[PDB]
Amino acid sequence: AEYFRDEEGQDVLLFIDNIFRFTQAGSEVSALLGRIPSAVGYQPTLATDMGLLQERITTTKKGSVTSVQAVYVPADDLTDPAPATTFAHLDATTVLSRGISELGIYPAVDPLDSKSRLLD
Amino acid sequence: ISYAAYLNVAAQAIRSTELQTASVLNRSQTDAFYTQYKNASEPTPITK
């Protein structure tokens, strides 16, 4: 993505499915690596790793990359630390909820839990 | 004065040897109000 964004200087797109898997993978290796694990098992480097990833996706004064990142909310609890720290770094989110799926509404986007910075 | 109203006043007077019951007293005492209306527009809920 960076090569297109920077060096080719063209607008791009990026899709990530799921960035929960990025988090998840890190927690798995973490224990083995030797780190004392943080609450809800996540690696203590969770904040830094999420940080590095989400600041390498940012849209420079060069290229403009619309990015779409998909978080597999673990056990569907949004309060869990992995979705929670993701929520901070996304300009708009469109949380899709299992309940609304049950109501039969496809797409299952929660209508009281969607936001965009550009909603204004 | 309507015939049944005429009979009504007589009935009320009639709740006065003596032998008195609650159902009688209730049959002669009411707190109901009647709200005139027009149009929407509402002339007051004058006591019935």
Partner: protein, 265 residues
């Protein structure tokens, strides 16, 4: 928290459950007295109907409607409203007299044009001759009842002790009494103004009966409704109980994990 927020919400549901139980029971108590009255009232009415039948009948319209001031007496309020609205199509310009706040609200909303008289202080009381008489007197003077060549009253016939079917009947104008097929088999006296008296007398006697029939249906409906409420509340008790139980297990596990992690160090 999950745990406390579950627990307090479940408590809310419990309090709701308790209230709906309580109301349903108290309603049953109230219903017995109501029902007793309605029998006696109906017996008086039947004697009057005996005349109207044998005489035959052969009658704009007036609309009178009966519900309680009190709410949460099931769908009495809106089922009756629906059947009034249906007959408000039939005669558009008819003047609706609403006896009871609940029927007042639905009809007033659907056409605020027709509301000319409305009553209050109906639902609390059990119908008595006094109420009917005064209402009747006001129908005659205020609404000039004879002017409408049809008169109809709506009420709720209490079909079964667990059902209510909204019902209406036509009150026969003073003109009707005059021209009814038979009226001469009964010995009319020109000296008395028996049509002009009997009209008035049956205006109230019929109306009181309508109020009695309605009142029994109303109290019956509230009992029915509050029973169904208890059931609905019960379902919510169960749903939040499961939530409580799940949340409870989760709290133990999550707390345990924190202790273990610490111990491991």
């Amino acid at each position: 928290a999950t745990l406390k927020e579950v627990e307090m919400r479940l408590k809310s549901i419990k309090n709701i459950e308790k209230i709906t139980k309580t109301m349903k029971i108290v309603a049953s108590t109230r219903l017995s007295k109501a029902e007793k009255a309605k029998i006696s009232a109906k017996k008086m009415d039947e004697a009057e109907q005996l005349f109207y039948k044998n005489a035959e009948t052969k009658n704009k319209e007036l609309i009178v409607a009966i519900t309680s001031d009190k709410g949460l007496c099931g769908s009495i309020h809106s089922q009756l409203a629906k059947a009034v609205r249906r007959h408000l199509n039939d005669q558009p310009n008819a003047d609706i007299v609403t006896i009871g706040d609940k029927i007042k609200m639905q009809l007033l909303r659907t056409h605020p044009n027709n509301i000319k008289l409305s009553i209050n202080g109906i639902g609390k009381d059990a119908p008595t001759f006094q109420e009917s008489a005064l209402i009747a007197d006001k129908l005659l003077s205020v609404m000039k009842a004879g002017t409408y060549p049809k008169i109809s009253i709506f009420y709720n016939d209490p079909v079964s002790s667990l059902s209510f079917e909204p019902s209406e009947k036509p009150i026969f104008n003073a003109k009707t009494i005059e021209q009814s097929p038979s009226f001469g088999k009964f010995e009319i006296d020109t000296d008395a103004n028996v049509p002009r008296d009997l009209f008035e007398y049956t205006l109230a006697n019929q109306m009181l009966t309508a109020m009695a029939q309605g009142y029994a249906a109303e109290i019956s409906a509230r009992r029915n409704a509050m029973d169904n409420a208890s059931k609905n509340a019960g379902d919510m008790i169960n749903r939040y109980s499961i939530l409580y139980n799940r949340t409870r297990q989760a709290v133990i596990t999550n707390e345990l994990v924190d202790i273990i992690t610490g111990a491991s160090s």
